[PDB]
Short mmCIF file of all heavy atoms in Angstrom, two decimals:
data_model
loop_
_atom_site.label_atom_id
_atom_site.label_comp_id
_atom_site.label_asym_id
_atom_site.label_seq_id
_atom_site.Cartn_x
_atom_site.Cartn_y
_atom_site.Cartn_z
N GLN A 673 -9.64 19.87 1.11
CA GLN A 673 -8.32 19.48 1.55
C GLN A 673 -7.80 18.34 0.68
O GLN A 673 -8.27 17.22 0.79
CB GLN A 673 -8.34 19.06 3.02
CG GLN A 673 -6.97 18.74 3.61
CD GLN A 673 -6.99 18.75 5.12
OE1 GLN A 673 -7.95 18.28 5.76
NE2 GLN A 673 -5.94 19.29 5.73
N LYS A 677 -2.34 17.65 1.96
CA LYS A 677 -2.16 19.09 1.81
C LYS A 677 -2.98 19.86 2.85
O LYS A 677 -3.59 19.27 3.75
CB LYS A 677 -2.59 19.53 0.40
CG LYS A 677 -1.87 18.80 -0.72
CD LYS A 677 -0.35 18.93 -0.63
CE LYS A 677 0.34 18.27 -1.80
NZ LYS A 677 1.81 18.25 -1.65
N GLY A 678 -2.97 21.18 2.74
CA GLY A 678 -3.65 22.04 3.70
C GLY A 678 -5.08 22.34 3.29
O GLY A 678 -5.65 21.69 2.42
N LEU A 679 -5.67 23.34 3.95
CA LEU A 679 -7.03 23.73 3.68
C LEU A 679 -7.09 24.78 2.59
O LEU A 679 -6.22 25.65 2.51
CB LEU A 679 -7.67 24.28 4.96
CG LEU A 679 -7.62 23.34 6.16
CD1 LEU A 679 -8.07 24.04 7.41
CD2 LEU A 679 -8.48 22.10 5.90
N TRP A 681 -10.10 27.25 0.66
CA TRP A 681 -11.48 27.71 0.50
C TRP A 681 -11.92 27.60 -0.95
O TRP A 681 -11.14 27.86 -1.88
CB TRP A 681 -11.60 29.16 1.00
CG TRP A 681 -12.88 29.82 0.63
CD1 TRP A 681 -14.07 29.70 1.30
CD2 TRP A 681 -13.10 30.75 -0.44
NE1 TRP A 681 -15.02 30.48 0.67
CE2 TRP A 681 -14.45 31.14 -0.38
CE3 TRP A 681 -12.28 31.27 -1.43
CZ2 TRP A 681 -14.99 32.03 -1.30
CZ3 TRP A 681 -12.82 32.17 -2.35
CH2 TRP A 681 -14.17 32.53 -2.27
N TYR A 694 -19.52 33.60 -3.76
CA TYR A 694 -18.11 33.85 -3.96
C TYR A 694 -17.37 32.57 -4.29
O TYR A 694 -17.74 31.52 -3.76
CB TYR A 694 -17.51 34.52 -2.72
CG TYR A 694 -18.17 35.84 -2.40
CD1 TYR A 694 -19.22 35.90 -1.50
CD2 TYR A 694 -17.75 37.00 -3.01
CE1 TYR A 694 -19.84 37.11 -1.21
CE2 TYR A 694 -18.36 38.22 -2.72
CZ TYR A 694 -19.40 38.27 -1.83
OH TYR A 694 -20.00 39.46 -1.57
N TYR A 730 -15.36 19.77 2.56
CA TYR A 730 -16.05 20.07 3.82
C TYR A 730 -17.15 21.10 3.65
O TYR A 730 -16.94 22.15 3.05
CB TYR A 730 -15.06 20.64 4.84
CG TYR A 730 -14.04 19.66 5.36
CD1 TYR A 730 -12.72 19.71 4.95
CD2 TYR A 730 -14.40 18.70 6.31
CE1 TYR A 730 -11.78 18.82 5.42
CE2 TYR A 730 -13.46 17.82 6.80
CZ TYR A 730 -12.15 17.88 6.36
OH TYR A 730 -11.22 16.99 6.86
N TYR A 735 -19.46 31.70 11.09
CA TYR A 735 -19.75 31.82 12.53
C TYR A 735 -20.56 33.06 12.91
O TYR A 735 -21.15 33.12 13.99
CB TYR A 735 -18.44 31.79 13.33
CG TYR A 735 -17.79 33.15 13.54
CD1 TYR A 735 -17.93 33.82 14.73
CD2 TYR A 735 -17.06 33.75 12.52
CE1 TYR A 735 -17.37 35.06 14.93
CE2 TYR A 735 -16.48 34.99 12.70
CZ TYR A 735 -16.63 35.65 13.92
OH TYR A 735 -16.06 36.87 14.10
N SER A 739 -19.31 37.33 8.70
CA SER A 739 -18.06 36.65 8.37
C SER A 739 -18.30 35.24 7.90
O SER A 739 -19.17 34.53 8.42
CB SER A 739 -17.12 36.63 9.58
OG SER A 739 -15.92 35.93 9.28
N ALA A 741 -15.76 33.14 8.07
CA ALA A 741 -14.86 32.35 8.90
C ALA A 741 -15.67 31.24 9.51
O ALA A 741 -16.73 31.46 10.10
CB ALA A 741 -14.22 33.20 9.98
N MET A 742 -15.19 29.99 9.38
CA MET A 742 -15.99 28.82 9.71
C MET A 742 -15.90 28.50 11.20
O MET A 742 -14.81 28.53 11.78
CB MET A 742 -15.51 27.59 8.95
CG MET A 742 -15.22 27.85 7.47
SD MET A 742 -13.54 28.45 7.17
CE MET A 742 -13.78 29.18 5.55
N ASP A 743 -17.04 28.16 11.83
CA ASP A 743 -16.96 27.57 13.15
C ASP A 743 -17.17 26.06 13.08
O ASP A 743 -16.28 25.30 13.48
CB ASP A 743 -17.87 28.26 14.20
CG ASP A 743 -19.34 28.34 13.79
OD1 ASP A 743 -19.72 27.91 12.69
OD2 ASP A 743 -20.12 28.88 14.61
N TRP A 745 -17.68 22.38 11.11
CA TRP A 745 -17.30 21.64 9.90
C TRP A 745 -17.97 20.29 9.88
O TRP A 745 -18.11 19.64 10.93
CB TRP A 745 -15.77 21.43 9.89
CG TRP A 745 -14.93 22.67 9.88
CD1 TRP A 745 -14.89 23.63 10.86
CD2 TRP A 745 -14.00 23.09 8.87
NE1 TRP A 745 -13.99 24.61 10.51
CE2 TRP A 745 -13.44 24.30 9.29
CE3 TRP A 745 -13.61 22.55 7.64
CZ2 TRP A 745 -12.49 24.98 8.53
CZ3 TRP A 745 -12.67 23.24 6.89
CH2 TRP A 745 -12.12 24.44 7.34
N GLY A 746 -18.36 19.81 8.70
CA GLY A 746 -18.78 18.44 8.55
C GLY A 746 -17.58 17.50 8.60
O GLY A 746 -16.45 17.95 8.78
N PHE A 764 4.36 -8.10 -3.66
CA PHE A 764 5.71 -8.64 -3.82
C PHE A 764 6.42 -8.68 -2.47
O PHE A 764 6.30 -7.73 -1.69
CB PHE A 764 6.50 -7.80 -4.81
CG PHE A 764 5.86 -7.70 -6.16
CD1 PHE A 764 5.40 -6.48 -6.64
CD2 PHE A 764 5.73 -8.82 -6.95
CE1 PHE A 764 4.81 -6.39 -7.88
CE2 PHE A 764 5.14 -8.73 -8.21
CZ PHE A 764 4.67 -7.51 -8.66
N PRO A 765 7.16 -9.76 -2.21
CA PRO A 765 7.82 -9.84 -0.90
C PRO A 765 9.03 -8.92 -0.81
O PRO A 765 9.74 -8.73 -1.80
CB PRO A 765 8.26 -11.30 -0.85
CG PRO A 765 8.50 -11.68 -2.26
CD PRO A 765 7.45 -10.92 -3.06
N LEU A 766 9.22 -8.34 0.34
CA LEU A 766 10.48 -7.64 0.66
C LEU A 766 11.22 -8.57 1.60
O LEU A 766 11.05 -8.51 2.81
CB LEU A 766 10.20 -6.28 1.30
CG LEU A 766 9.39 -5.31 0.42
CD1 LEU A 766 8.95 -4.08 1.19
CD2 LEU A 766 10.19 -4.91 -0.81
N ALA A 767 12.02 -9.46 1.02
CA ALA A 767 12.61 -10.56 1.77
C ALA A 767 13.67 -10.09 2.76
O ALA A 767 14.43 -9.18 2.47
CB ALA A 767 13.22 -11.58 0.81
N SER A 770 19.88 -11.86 3.76
CA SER A 770 20.64 -13.02 4.20
C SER A 770 21.77 -12.59 5.12
O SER A 770 22.38 -13.41 5.79
CB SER A 770 21.18 -13.78 2.99
OG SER A 770 22.13 -13.01 2.27
N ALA A 779 14.63 -6.88 9.09
CA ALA A 779 13.44 -6.24 8.53
C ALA A 779 12.96 -7.00 7.31
O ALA A 779 13.74 -7.55 6.56
CB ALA A 779 13.73 -4.80 8.18
N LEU A 783 5.49 -5.29 -0.71
CA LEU A 783 5.24 -4.17 -1.60
C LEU A 783 3.89 -4.41 -2.27
O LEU A 783 3.71 -5.42 -2.97
CB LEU A 783 6.34 -4.07 -2.65
CG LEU A 783 6.13 -3.07 -3.77
CD1 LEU A 783 5.99 -1.65 -3.22
CD2 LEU A 783 7.26 -3.15 -4.79
N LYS A 785 1.65 -3.10 -4.96
CA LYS A 785 1.90 -2.21 -6.08
C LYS A 785 0.78 -2.15 -7.12
O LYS A 785 0.15 -3.17 -7.44
CB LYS A 785 3.19 -2.66 -6.79
CG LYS A 785 3.77 -1.64 -7.77
CD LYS A 785 5.10 -2.09 -8.32
CE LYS A 785 5.46 -1.30 -9.58
NZ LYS A 785 5.40 0.16 -9.38
N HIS A 806 5.25 -1.20 10.39
CA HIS A 806 5.05 0.12 9.80
C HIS A 806 4.40 -0.03 8.44
O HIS A 806 5.04 -0.51 7.49
CB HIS A 806 6.35 0.89 9.67
CG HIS A 806 6.99 1.22 10.99
ND1 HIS A 806 6.40 2.03 11.93
CD2 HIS A 806 8.20 0.87 11.50
CE1 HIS A 806 7.20 2.14 12.97
NE2 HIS A 806 8.29 1.46 12.72
N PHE A 808 3.07 2.10 5.42
CA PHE A 808 3.26 3.46 4.95
C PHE A 808 2.07 4.01 4.18
O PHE A 808 1.34 3.24 3.54
CB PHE A 808 4.50 3.54 4.09
CG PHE A 808 5.77 3.28 4.86
CD1 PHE A 808 6.37 2.03 4.86
CD2 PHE A 808 6.36 4.30 5.59
CE1 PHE A 808 7.52 1.81 5.56
CE2 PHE A 808 7.52 4.07 6.30
CZ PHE A 808 8.09 2.82 6.29
N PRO A 809 1.87 5.32 4.22
CA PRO A 809 0.86 5.95 3.36
C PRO A 809 1.09 5.57 1.89
O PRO A 809 2.23 5.47 1.43
CB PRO A 809 1.09 7.46 3.55
CG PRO A 809 1.74 7.57 4.89
CD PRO A 809 2.55 6.32 5.06
N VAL A 811 1.33 5.95 -2.10
CA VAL A 811 1.82 6.99 -2.98
C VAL A 811 1.16 6.89 -4.35
O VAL A 811 1.04 5.80 -4.90
CB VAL A 811 3.34 6.89 -3.15
CG1 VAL A 811 3.83 7.91 -4.20
CG2 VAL A 811 4.06 7.12 -1.83
N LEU A 812 0.71 8.01 -4.88
CA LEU A 812 0.13 8.07 -6.19
C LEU A 812 1.23 8.16 -7.24
O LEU A 812 2.00 9.14 -7.26
CB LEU A 812 -0.82 9.27 -6.33
CG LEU A 812 -1.49 9.40 -7.69
CD1 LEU A 812 -2.35 8.18 -8.00
CD2 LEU A 812 -2.34 10.67 -7.74
N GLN A 813 1.33 7.14 -8.07
CA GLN A 813 2.37 7.05 -9.09
C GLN A 813 1.93 7.83 -10.33
O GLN A 813 0.76 8.15 -10.48
CB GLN A 813 2.63 5.59 -9.43
CG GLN A 813 3.14 4.78 -8.24
CD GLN A 813 3.09 3.28 -8.47
OE1 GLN A 813 4.13 2.61 -8.48
NE2 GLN A 813 1.89 2.76 -8.64
N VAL A 823 6.11 -2.90 6.32
CA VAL A 823 7.30 -3.58 6.80
C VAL A 823 7.16 -3.93 8.27
O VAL A 823 6.26 -3.43 8.95
CB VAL A 823 8.57 -2.70 6.62
CG1 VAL A 823 8.72 -2.29 5.16
CG2 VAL A 823 8.49 -1.47 7.53
N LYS A 856 15.17 -15.52 0.87
CA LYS A 856 15.27 -15.95 -0.51
C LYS A 856 16.26 -17.10 -0.61
O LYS A 856 17.40 -16.96 -0.16
CB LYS A 856 15.72 -14.78 -1.40
CG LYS A 856 15.56 -15.04 -2.88
CD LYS A 856 16.09 -13.87 -3.71
CE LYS A 856 15.82 -14.07 -5.21
NZ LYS A 856 16.45 -13.01 -6.04
N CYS A 858 19.00 -19.63 -1.90
CA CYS A 858 20.20 -19.49 -2.71
C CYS A 858 21.44 -19.82 -1.88
O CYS A 858 21.37 -19.83 -0.65
CB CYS A 858 20.32 -18.07 -3.27
SG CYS A 858 20.13 -16.77 -2.03
N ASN C 98 -8.26 34.12 12.16
CA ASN C 98 -8.88 33.00 12.84
C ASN C 98 -7.91 31.83 12.91
O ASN C 98 -7.10 31.66 12.01
CB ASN C 98 -10.16 32.57 12.10
CG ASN C 98 -11.07 33.75 11.77
OD1 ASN C 98 -11.95 34.12 12.55
ND2 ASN C 98 -10.86 34.35 10.61
N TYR C 100 -7.34 27.54 13.61
CA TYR C 100 -7.95 26.21 13.67
C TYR C 100 -6.96 25.16 14.13
O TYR C 100 -5.74 25.27 13.90
CB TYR C 100 -8.49 25.83 12.30
CG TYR C 100 -9.59 26.73 11.82
CD1 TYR C 100 -9.30 27.89 11.13
CD2 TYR C 100 -10.92 26.44 12.10
CE1 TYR C 100 -10.29 28.74 10.70
CE2 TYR C 100 -11.92 27.30 11.69
CZ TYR C 100 -11.60 28.43 10.98
OH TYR C 100 -12.59 29.29 10.55
N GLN C 102 -6.39 20.91 13.70
CA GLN C 102 -6.81 19.70 13.00
C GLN C 102 -5.95 18.51 13.40
O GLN C 102 -4.73 18.55 13.29
CB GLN C 102 -6.74 19.87 11.48
CG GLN C 102 -7.43 18.75 10.72
CD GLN C 102 -7.37 18.90 9.22
OE1 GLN C 102 -6.42 19.45 8.68
NE2 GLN C 102 -8.40 18.40 8.54
N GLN C 106 -9.47 13.96 11.16
CA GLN C 106 -10.58 14.72 11.72
C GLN C 106 -10.79 16.07 11.01
O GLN C 106 -9.88 16.60 10.35
CB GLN C 106 -10.35 14.98 13.21
CG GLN C 106 -10.36 13.72 14.07
CD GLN C 106 -10.25 14.04 15.55
OE1 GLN C 106 -10.42 15.19 15.98
NE2 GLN C 106 -9.94 13.02 16.36
N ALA C 107 -11.99 16.62 11.17
CA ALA C 107 -12.30 17.95 10.65
C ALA C 107 -11.61 19.00 11.53
O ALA C 107 -11.38 18.76 12.70
CB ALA C 107 -13.79 18.17 10.65
N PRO C 108 -11.31 20.18 10.95
CA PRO C 108 -10.74 21.26 11.75
C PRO C 108 -11.69 21.75 12.85
O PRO C 108 -12.91 21.58 12.75
CB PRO C 108 -10.49 22.37 10.72
CG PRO C 108 -10.42 21.66 9.41
CD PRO C 108 -11.37 20.51 9.52
N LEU C 110 -12.41 25.29 15.28
CA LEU C 110 -12.14 26.71 15.47
C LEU C 110 -11.70 27.00 16.89
O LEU C 110 -12.43 26.69 17.84
CB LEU C 110 -13.37 27.55 15.11
CG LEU C 110 -13.26 29.05 15.34
CD1 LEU C 110 -12.26 29.69 14.39
CD2 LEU C 110 -14.63 29.71 15.22
N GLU C 114 -12.08 36.15 14.70
CA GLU C 114 -11.78 37.55 14.48
C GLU C 114 -11.72 38.34 15.78
O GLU C 114 -12.61 38.23 16.63
CB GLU C 114 -12.84 38.18 13.57
CG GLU C 114 -12.95 37.53 12.18
CD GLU C 114 -14.12 38.08 11.37
OE1 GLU C 114 -15.04 38.66 11.98
OE2 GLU C 114 -14.10 37.94 10.13
N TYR C 151 -3.86 25.79 11.63
CA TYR C 151 -3.97 26.64 10.45
C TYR C 151 -4.51 28.01 10.85
O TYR C 151 -5.37 28.11 11.71
CB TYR C 151 -4.94 26.04 9.43
CG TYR C 151 -4.49 24.72 8.82
CD1 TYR C 151 -4.99 23.50 9.26
CD2 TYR C 151 -3.59 24.70 7.77
CE1 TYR C 151 -4.60 22.31 8.71
CE2 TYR C 151 -3.17 23.51 7.20
CZ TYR C 151 -3.68 22.32 7.67
OH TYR C 151 -3.29 21.12 7.10
N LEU C 153 -6.40 31.58 9.27
CA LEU C 153 -7.33 31.93 8.21
C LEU C 153 -7.68 33.39 8.31
O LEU C 153 -8.12 33.84 9.36
CB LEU C 153 -8.61 31.09 8.30
CG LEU C 153 -9.79 31.61 7.46
CD1 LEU C 153 -9.57 31.34 5.98
CD2 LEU C 153 -11.12 31.01 7.92
N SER C 155 -10.25 36.35 7.22
CA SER C 155 -11.62 36.51 6.76
C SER C 155 -11.93 37.97 6.48
O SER C 155 -13.08 38.40 6.50
CB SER C 155 -12.60 35.91 7.80
OG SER C 155 -12.32 36.41 9.09
N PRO C 159 -10.65 36.28 -1.94
CA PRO C 159 -10.81 34.91 -1.46
C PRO C 159 -10.31 34.70 -0.04
O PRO C 159 -9.28 35.26 0.34
CB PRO C 159 -9.93 34.10 -2.43
CG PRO C 159 -8.88 35.07 -2.84
CD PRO C 159 -9.58 36.40 -2.93
N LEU C 160 -11.06 33.91 0.74
CA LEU C 160 -10.58 33.55 2.06
C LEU C 160 -9.36 32.67 1.91
O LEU C 160 -9.35 31.72 1.10
CB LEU C 160 -11.69 32.81 2.85
CG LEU C 160 -12.49 33.69 3.79
CD1 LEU C 160 -13.28 34.74 3.01
CD2 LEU C 160 -13.42 32.87 4.67
N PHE C 162 -5.86 30.58 3.73
CA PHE C 162 -5.29 29.92 4.89
C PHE C 162 -3.77 29.93 4.82
O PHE C 162 -3.19 29.99 3.74
CB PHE C 162 -5.70 28.44 4.92
CG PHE C 162 -7.16 28.18 5.15
CD1 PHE C 162 -8.05 28.09 4.10
CD2 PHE C 162 -7.63 27.98 6.44
CE1 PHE C 162 -9.39 27.83 4.32
CE2 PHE C 162 -8.98 27.72 6.67
CZ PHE C 162 -9.85 27.63 5.61
N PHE C 180 17.66 -0.52 5.90
CA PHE C 180 17.54 -1.79 5.21
C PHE C 180 17.27 -1.54 3.73
O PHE C 180 16.48 -0.67 3.38
CB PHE C 180 16.40 -2.62 5.79
CG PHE C 180 16.53 -2.87 7.28
CD1 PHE C 180 16.02 -1.95 8.19
CD2 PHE C 180 17.11 -4.01 7.74
CE1 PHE C 180 16.12 -2.18 9.55
CE2 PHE C 180 17.21 -4.26 9.12
CZ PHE C 180 16.71 -3.33 10.00
N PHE C 182 16.11 -3.47 0.03
CA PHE C 182 15.46 -4.63 -0.51
C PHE C 182 15.51 -4.62 -2.03
O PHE C 182 15.03 -3.66 -2.65
CB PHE C 182 13.99 -4.69 -0.08
CG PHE C 182 13.79 -4.77 1.40
CD1 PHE C 182 13.53 -3.63 2.14
CD2 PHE C 182 13.84 -5.99 2.05
CE1 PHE C 182 13.33 -3.70 3.50
CE2 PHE C 182 13.66 -6.07 3.42
CZ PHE C 182 13.39 -4.92 4.14
N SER C 185 11.77 -8.41 -6.09
CA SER C 185 11.53 -9.84 -6.10
C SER C 185 11.59 -10.37 -7.52
O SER C 185 11.41 -9.61 -8.47
CB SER C 185 10.16 -10.15 -5.50
OG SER C 185 9.13 -9.72 -6.39
N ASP C 186 11.86 -11.66 -7.67
CA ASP C 186 11.91 -12.28 -9.00
C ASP C 186 10.55 -12.21 -9.67
O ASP C 186 10.46 -12.04 -10.89
CB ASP C 186 12.37 -13.73 -8.89
CG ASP C 186 13.85 -13.86 -8.54
OD1 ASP C 186 14.58 -12.85 -8.70
OD2 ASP C 186 14.25 -14.95 -8.14
N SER C 187 9.48 -12.36 -8.88
CA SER C 187 8.14 -12.31 -9.42
C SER C 187 7.83 -10.95 -10.03
O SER C 187 7.18 -10.86 -11.07
CB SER C 187 7.09 -12.68 -8.35
OG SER C 187 7.34 -12.05 -7.12
N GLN C 188 8.31 -9.87 -9.40
CA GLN C 188 8.10 -8.55 -9.99
C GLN C 188 8.89 -8.39 -11.28
O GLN C 188 8.38 -7.89 -12.27
CB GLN C 188 8.46 -7.41 -9.03
CG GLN C 188 8.07 -6.05 -9.62
CD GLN C 188 8.55 -4.86 -8.81
OE1 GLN C 188 9.45 -4.99 -7.96
NE2 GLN C 188 7.96 -3.71 -9.06
N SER C 195 11.23 -2.61 -8.56
CA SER C 195 11.16 -1.67 -7.47
C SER C 195 12.20 -2.01 -6.42
O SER C 195 12.26 -3.14 -5.93
CB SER C 195 9.77 -1.69 -6.82
OG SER C 195 8.76 -1.34 -7.76
N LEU C 199 14.41 1.18 3.56
CA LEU C 199 13.65 1.47 4.78
C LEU C 199 14.54 2.19 5.81
O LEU C 199 15.62 1.71 6.14
CB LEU C 199 13.10 0.19 5.38
CG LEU C 199 12.58 0.25 6.81
CD1 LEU C 199 11.34 1.12 6.91
CD2 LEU C 199 12.31 -1.15 7.36
N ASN C 201 14.19 3.08 9.65
CA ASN C 201 13.35 2.62 10.76
C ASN C 201 13.63 3.33 12.07
O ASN C 201 14.76 3.33 12.57
CB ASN C 201 13.52 1.10 10.90
CG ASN C 201 12.60 0.51 11.96
OD1 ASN C 201 11.42 0.29 11.71
ND2 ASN C 201 13.17 0.22 13.13
N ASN C 202 12.59 3.97 12.61
CA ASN C 202 12.58 4.53 13.98
C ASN C 202 13.60 5.62 14.24
O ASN C 202 14.48 5.43 15.10
CB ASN C 202 12.74 3.42 15.01
CG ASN C 202 11.62 2.40 14.97
OD1 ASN C 202 10.61 2.60 14.29
ND2 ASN C 202 11.77 1.32 15.71
N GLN C 224 10.31 7.71 -4.96
CA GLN C 224 9.24 8.33 -4.16
C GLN C 224 9.38 7.91 -2.70
O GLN C 224 9.71 6.76 -2.42
CB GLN C 224 7.86 7.93 -4.70
CG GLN C 224 7.52 8.55 -6.06
CD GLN C 224 6.06 8.32 -6.46
OE1 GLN C 224 5.22 9.23 -6.34
NE2 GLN C 224 5.75 7.13 -6.92
N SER C 226 7.73 7.89 1.39
CA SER C 226 6.54 7.95 2.22
C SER C 226 6.98 7.84 3.68
O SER C 226 7.95 7.16 3.97
CB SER C 226 5.58 6.81 1.85
OG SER C 226 4.40 6.86 2.65
N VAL C 227 6.25 8.52 4.57
CA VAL C 227 6.63 8.54 5.98
C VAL C 227 5.43 8.29 6.90
O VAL C 227 4.31 8.67 6.60
CB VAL C 227 7.26 9.90 6.38
CG1 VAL C 227 8.53 10.12 5.61
CG2 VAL C 227 6.27 11.03 6.13
N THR C 228 5.71 7.62 8.02
CA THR C 228 4.69 7.34 9.01
C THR C 228 4.53 8.55 9.92
O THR C 228 5.39 9.42 9.97
CB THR C 228 5.09 6.15 9.88
OG1 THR C 228 6.37 6.40 10.48
CG2 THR C 228 5.15 4.88 9.05
N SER C 238 9.28 6.63 10.68
CA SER C 238 9.87 5.67 9.76
C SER C 238 9.58 6.13 8.36
O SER C 238 8.60 6.83 8.10
CB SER C 238 9.31 4.26 9.99
OG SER C 238 9.76 3.75 11.23
N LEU C 239 10.45 5.74 7.43
CA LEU C 239 10.36 6.23 6.07
C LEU C 239 10.75 5.14 5.09
O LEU C 239 11.66 4.34 5.36
CB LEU C 239 11.28 7.45 5.89
CG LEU C 239 11.34 8.12 4.52
CD1 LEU C 239 11.71 9.58 4.67
CD2 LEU C 239 12.33 7.43 3.60
N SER C 240 10.05 5.09 3.97
CA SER C 240 10.40 4.17 2.90
C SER C 240 10.66 5.00 1.64
O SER C 240 9.92 5.93 1.33
CB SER C 240 9.28 3.18 2.63
OG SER C 240 8.27 3.79 1.83
N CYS C 278 22.88 -13.57 -3.24
CA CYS C 278 21.96 -14.11 -2.24
C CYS C 278 21.67 -13.10 -1.16
O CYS C 278 20.57 -13.09 -0.57
CB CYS C 278 22.54 -15.40 -1.62
SG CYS C 278 21.41 -16.28 -0.53
#
Side-chain angles (χ1 to χ4, degrees):
Chain A
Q673 184 162 39
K677 305 303 184 186
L679 304 171
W681 168 81
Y694 299 94
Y730 290 105
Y735 89 101
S739 178
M742 316 87 200
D743 55 358
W745 299 63
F764 303 114
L766 300 170
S770 65
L783 171 61
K785 193 175 163 53
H806 295 298
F808 293 98
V811 174
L812 180 60
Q813 298 166 118
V823 303
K856 192 183 185 186
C858 50
Chain C
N98 312 270
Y100 297 88
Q102 192 180 31
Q106 294 185 15
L110 176 68
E114 301 174 339
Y151 294 101
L153 165 73
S155 50
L160 263 64
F162 292 91
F180 303 87
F182 299 97
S185 70
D186 289 343
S187 45
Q188 187 187 17
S195 299
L199 166 67
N201 184 79
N202 298 351
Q224 290 190 102
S226 181
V227 297
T228 56
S238 292
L239 180 153
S240 80
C278 188

